[PDB]
Amino acid sequence: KPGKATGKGKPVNNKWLNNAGKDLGSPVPDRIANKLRDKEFKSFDDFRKKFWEEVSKDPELSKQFSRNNNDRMKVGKAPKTRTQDVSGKRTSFELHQEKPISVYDMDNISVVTPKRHIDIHRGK
DNA sequence: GGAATTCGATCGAATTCC
DNA sequence: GGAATTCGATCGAATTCC
Ligand SMILES: [Zn+2]
């Protein structure tokens, strides 16, 4: 299931993931989208790692993540969410993909907290 | 009937292979 | 180093015991 990353993303501030626990979550930063756009991906896992890797490279974004979180993103692992936003063993930020019942649209990909992601996939 | 386990949709992430 | 395979997690409806 290889494809091309497409999308304009969206402008984010220094409170990027604050609303990552409500609705569909935080959007894909335009800066990040410009770095992934047009690139191929062999799977969503690939896209996920490359995504967090990019975030660790954006100065304005990394400053929002503790040293430990930045270390994880530097190798492709997702940053750890607040302790109250986890769900059992799932304690890392997750990427939600919006798409019809019937492909890497960065305008349909968002960052959510395990807690919030579980509700979404059960109606809320 | 009701408890126990299965399993498919959604995920992160490690292991395995050339 | 990159890509495919395998491992786990969560949830709960559907399905399998007993
Ligand atoms: Zn989702």
**Strand B–CB A63 distance below 7 A:** no
Record the resolution, in angstroms.
Answer: 2.8
Q: Which domain holds residue A96?
A: 1-124
What are the C-alpha distances in Å from A83 to residues A41, A59, A88, A93, A100? 31, 25, 10, 11, 32
Q: How far is the CA of A121 from the centre of ligand 1 (A)?
A: 6
Residue whose CA is minimally distant from C12 C1': A122
Rg (CA), chain A: 14
Q: How far is the CA of A97 from the centre of ligand 1 (A)?
A: 5
Count of structural domains, chain A: 1
Find the CATH number of the domain harbouring A83: 3.90.540.10
Which experimental approach was used here?
Answer: X-ray
Measured CA to CA, the distance from residue A97 to residue A122 in angstroms comes to 15
Q: How far is the CA of A95 from the centre of ligand 1 (A)?
A: 7
Measured CA to CA, the distance from residue A1 to residue A65 in angstroms comes to 31
DSSP letters, chain A, are --EEEE---B---S-TTTTTTSTT-EE-BHHHHHHHTT-EESSHHHHHHHHHHHHHH-HHHHTTS-HHHHHHHTTTPPPB--GGG-BTTB-B-EEEE------EETTSEEEE-HHHHHHHTTT-
**Strand B–CB A1 distance below 7 A:** no
